[PDB]
A paper describes a structure:
To strengthen this hypothesis, four mutations were inserted at position 76: D76A, D76E, D76H, and D76K. The crystal structures of D76A, D76E, and D76H were determined to high resolution. Analogously to the structure of D76N2, these structures do not show any major conformational change compared to wt β2m. The side chain of Arg97 presents different conformations, and the strength of its interactions with the EF loop and to Trp95 varies in different mutants; residue Met99 interacts with Ser11 or with Arg12. Such observations suggest a role for residue 76 in determining the interactions within the EF loop and with β2m C-terminal region. A saturation site mutagenesis (D76 to E, H, and A) allowed us to show here how position 76 is indeed crucial in the β2m fold, any mutation at this position results in a notable decrease in thermal stability and a remarkable increase in aggregation propensity as observed for D76N.
A recent case of systemic amyloidosis involves the highly unstable D76N mutation of beta-2 microglobulin (β2m). The D76N mutant is strongly amyloidogenic and, in contrast to the wt protein, aggregates efficiently and abundantly without seeding and under native conditions. Indeed, the 76 position is located in a solvent exposed loop between β-strands E and F. A detailed analysis of the interaction energies of the ensembles reveals that D76 is at the center of a network of stabilizing electrostatic interactions that are lost in the D76N mutant.
Author numbering: 0 to 99
The structure:
Amino acid sequence: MIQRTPKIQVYSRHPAENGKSNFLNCYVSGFHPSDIEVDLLKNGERIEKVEHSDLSFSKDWSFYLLYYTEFTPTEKHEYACRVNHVTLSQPKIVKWDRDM
């Protein structure tokens, strides 16, 4: 058996086709087993509509998840990713660093 803690990155991207739109992304990488819970948060509250969740694996024991949705960020709110996994004793909350 193998278990590996997810690496978690939170970042924003504008699709080059439409620069006015903005996507909030949570890239959860290199984890095993594949069982996982991932949410995007706004002010600590779960964002219900996340239009994209893309799961893949490399080797049989390494999973990759890109979880993202359109948003219009303001300075008034805090955005984050919350991840639960068997390797994590408590939920991991990673705040969006707005430089990325």
